[PDB]
Each structure stands twice: as structure tokens, then as C-alpha cells.
Amino acid sequence: XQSLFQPITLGALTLKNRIVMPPLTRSRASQPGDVANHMMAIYYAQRASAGLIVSEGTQISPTAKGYAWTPGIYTPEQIAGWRIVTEAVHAKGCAIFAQLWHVGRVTHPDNIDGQQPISSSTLKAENVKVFVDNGSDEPGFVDVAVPRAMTKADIAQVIADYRQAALNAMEAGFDGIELHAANGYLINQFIDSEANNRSDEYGGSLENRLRFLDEVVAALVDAIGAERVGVRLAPLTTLNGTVDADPILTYTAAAALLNKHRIVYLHIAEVDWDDAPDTPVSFKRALREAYQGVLIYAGRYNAEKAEQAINDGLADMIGFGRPFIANPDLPERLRHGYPLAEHVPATLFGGGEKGLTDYPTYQA
Ligand SMILES: Cc1cc2nc3c(=O)[nH]c(=O)nc-3n(C[C@H](O)[C@H](O)[C@H](O)COP(=O)(O)O)c2cc1C
Ligand SMILES: CCCCCCCCO[C@@H]1O[C@H](CO)[C@@H](O)[C@H](O)[C@H]1O
Ligand SMILES: CCCCCCCCO[C@@H]1O[C@H](CO)[C@@H](O)[C@H](O)[C@H]1O
């Protein structure tokens, strides 16, 4: 764990250690209005011994939402709710980035004001469910809907919505933003060949499949500065329905394109739930040459694997998702080899403080 507990520079920030709390949707936002709240602020501040916190995905508009009760970042009240979170986190000494979210086709009309979802094309995500509010206190799981293909004008609108969400995040006191371009969501529906059937300049070729990503990142950078923009990618997982035919090429190229934008970090989502594909070391080393900023990986890491990835020159920082849910003091536990609590799946989403803020710190 020695390297894991070394500080690191992230743009204009000095971070305490190499541990990241990656984005973790908890569906705790206040209703009506999908507003970040007190319980969330406590939750994040409890975990502020991380080097970096990346918020749960936060939708950039009403039609960007995938799941019931996720917090938005487009209304004034939503910005203010996030400010209570960022104030709490900053009082503990920690950096926090907002994960800007558009789910594209991975939603249900019930979550987007009855609208049909949008995507690169009209392809439904196969074997994918989201959850909706059905009036009960627990999430109601449902099949996703068939999307409509985005027009030119839809692309302009979404870019504008991302751009403004970045400014909103700065107004909310975040230190930066993370673009969610991973886990089968909207941008990923353009990147991955088998999700993109477009015949215009946003599909077919590799350069066209990366164009939406390029244009969104350019707008984010223009709005808030490259030193405040990270991006998340998922080259090899396919759980939410996006498959690329030549992911080593596509994602090495994406990494090099993002390097050209000088984004402050690149975050690789190596596992999604129990989708844990073989991610060759040779590929990881290629990504490390293609993108020369701070490289973050998350997915089934433990202390040993995290330290090894850093010492082998594969990663600069490591995210721990599920362990951070149940271990607010995860860094201290990793450093000392204290046993980790395990999380309760039934309280991951929805509800209140139970299973959110009531996991204790370690006590022998
Ligand atoms: C409850 C839960 C919610 C998640 N929500 C998001 C999210 O909002 N955005 C995202 O990019 N990843 C999300 N993820 C994925 C995690 O960031 C992480 O990449 C994944 O859980 C693998 O890391 P782990 O094996 O350490 O948990 C979620 C994971 C879990 C368990
Ligand atoms: C610095 C010491 C003062 C601590 C301020 C504590 C703020 C807690 O705030 C409380 O959080 C609860 C959720 O846990 C909500 O249900 C309450 O409405 C909210 O007032
Ligand atoms: C409205 C938001 C109020 C946030 C108050 C800070 C919440 C985190 O409080 C932290 O909780 C840890 C237990 O997990 C304690 O061990 C730390 O001492 C405590 O400061």
C-alpha cells in the first residue's frame, strides 16, 4: 500500500492519496425536484478521506435521467443542494468532481417525463433494466424503451446541456467534472460500433464514432478548463448493451483524442457489476502511452491489486466502489489491513439514511 498512500497532483489540486471514491448512484435525491440533500452531504463527507470523490451520476437535463431519484444538476435548487455536499466535503479536506450524466437509451419514459429516450440510433439496449418510481418506497425494475435516433439539432442541444451543466457544477462548488462516457450511456452509444448505425458524420467510421465525444469534451473544456475535466470510458464491459467490434483500436484512439484535449484525468471502468472482462496488461500499457494525464481505474480492486497496478505503471489512482459504500473509512482500513464491511444490496438505491450513512467506521 505504500504507493497508494502517496499524494498526487490533479491539475491545480494536490490530492492526499491515490484512492478514488468512484461514482455510485444511490437514488437518494429529494422529491419533488431530484435535489441533492443533507443525507447525501453527510454520506460524501464521511468518505472524504479519499484522495478524490467523483459524485454519482447527475443528469444534465430532464431527458438525461435513467433511474428514479437520481440528483440533477440543471435547476437552481439542484445546484444549491449540491453546494451543501461540496461544502461538507471541502470542510473535510477533499476534492470532489461532479459526474455529468446523459443515459441516452438506458431509461424508461417514466423517468423522462413520458418522452421517448434518445440515442445514436433506434437500437434498444438488449437485456437491460432500469428502475422507476412506481409509488412504493422501493425501486420498480423495468425493461428499457426503444429510443429514437438523435437529430443534428438534438446533438447541439445535448452539447449545450453538457456545457451548461459544467458551469452549474462550478457554481455548486465542485472542483471539476467527470464526463460519463462509459457503461453503455449516451456517449458510449455513439462510440461503440454495434450500438451506432448512423450514416451521417456521427457514425460508421472510427473518427465519426468519436465525434460526439470530441465535441462534448471540446465544449466542457471551453466552459471550465481542461484542468477541471475528466472523462470515464468502459472499453470492454458490455453489460448495458454497448459492444464495440475493435475496442483496442477504438479506445486507444479515444484515449489519444482525449490526450489532445489535455483532460486532467481519464477514468477506466474496468468492471461493471459482475461484468469483469479480461483487460490485457498490454492494452493497459497502450492506454498509458496514449493518454499521459492522471489515469484512474476502478473495478474489483483490493489493496494488493491497487498497489500493484500503480507500481507496474498502469494506473496513477484506483477507485473502490462497492467497498466505499460499506466502509466510510476505507483508506484507513486499506492502509492497516482492517477487515472490510460488506454492503447490503437491498439499500443501494432509494430509501433514506439506512444503508447510506449508518455504516460505521472501524472499531476493533
Ligand atoms: C451502487 C452502484 C452505483 C453505481 N453508479 C455509477 C454511476 O453513477 N456512474 C458510474 O460511472 N458508475 C457507477 N457505478 C460503477 C462504479 O463506479 C464502479 O466502477 C464499479 O462498481 C466497479 O468498482 P468496484 O468493483 O470497486 O465496485 C455504480 C456502481 C454501484 C455498485
Ligand atoms: C458542524 C456541526 C453541525 C452539523 C450539521 C448537521 C446537519 C444535519 O442536517 C439534518 O440532516 C438530516 C439527515 O441526516 C435531515 O433529515 C435533516 O432534515 C437535516 O437538518
Ligand atoms: C449537512 C452535512 C453535514 C455533514 C457533517 C459531516 C459528516 C461526516 O462526519 C464525519 O463522520 C465520520 C463517521 O463516519 C466521523 O468519524 C468524522 O469524525 C465525522 O466528522
Residue 11, domain CATH: 3.20.20.70
Contacts 24+ apart (CB under 8 A), 282-291: 283/235, 283/248, 283/252, 284/314, 284/315, 285/313, 285/314, 286/248, 286/252, 287/251, 287/252, 287/255, 288/313, 288/314, 290/252, 290/253, 290/255, 290/256, 290/259, 291/255, 291/256, 291/258, 291/259, 291/266
The upper half-sphere exposure of residue 113, i.e. CA atoms within 13 Å in the direction of its Cβ, equals: 6
How many domains does the chain divide into? 1
Q: From 5, 65, 8, select the one nearest 34 (Cα to Cα).
A: 65
Strand extents, DSSP E, the chain: 8-10, 13-15, 19-21, 52-59, 95-101, 118-119, 129-132, 140-143, 148-149, 176-180, 229-233, 265-269, 294-298, 317-319
State the pairing for strand pair 19-21/317-319: parallel
CB atoms within 10 A of CB 109: 15
- Tell me which method was used to determine the 3D structure: X-ray
Beta carbon of 348 within 6 Å of any ligand 1 atom: yes
Question: Does residue 285 contact residue 268 with C-beta atoms inside 8 Å?
Answer: no
Beta carbon of 42 within 6 Å of any ligand 3 atom: yes
Please list, in sequence order, all residues whose beta carbon lies within 8 angstroms of the beta carbon of residue 62, skipping any fewer than 6 positions away: 72, 74, 112, 113
Residue 142 — φ and ψ, nearest 5°?
-140, 155
Rg (CA), the chain: 19
Q: From 197, 191, 193, select the one nearest 210 (Cα to Cα).
A: 191
What does the block give as the cell for 353? 439514511
Which residue range(s) make up the domain with 190?
2-364
Instruction: Pick the ligand that lies closest to the CA of residue 92.
Output: 3
What does the block give as the cell for 185? 450511456
Question: Does residue 84 contact residue 38 with C-beta atoms inside 8 Å?
Answer: yes
d(CA 47, CA 244): 35
Assess whether 301 carries a catalytic annotation.
Answer: no
Query: Residue with the nearest Cα to atom 17 of ligand 2?
Result: 38
Ligand 1 atom having least distance to the Cα of 183 = 11
Omega before 32 cis (within 30°)? yes
How are the residues of the chain apportioned to helix, strand and coil, as percentages rounded to the nearest 5? 35, 20, 45
3-state secondary structure of 327: coil
**Residue with cell string 473518427:** 207
Q: How many residues does this entry show for the chain? A: 364
Q: What element of type H or E holds 136?
A: none
d(CA 307, CA 176): 26
* Best residue for ligand 1 mutational test, from 21, 25, 301 (most atoms within 8 Å of Cβ): 25
What does the block give as the cell for 256? 489519444
Q: What element of type H or E holds 257?
A: helix 247-260
43, 185, 297, 359: the catalytic one is 185
Q: From 48, 18, 165, 191, select the one nearest 102 (Cα to Cα).
A: 165
Beta carbon of 71 within 6 Å of any ligand 1 atom: no
Instruction: Pick the ligand that lies closest to the CA of residue 39.
Output: 2
d(CA 36, CA 97): 14
Alpha carbon of residue 8 to chain centroid: 21
d(CA 150, CA 352): 36
Question: Does residue 101 contact residue 59 with C-beta atoms inside 8 Å?
Answer: yes
* Best residue for ligand 3 mutational test, from 35, 42, 85 (most atoms within 8 Å of Cβ): 42
Instruction: Pick the ligand that lies closest to the CA of residue 345.
Output: 1
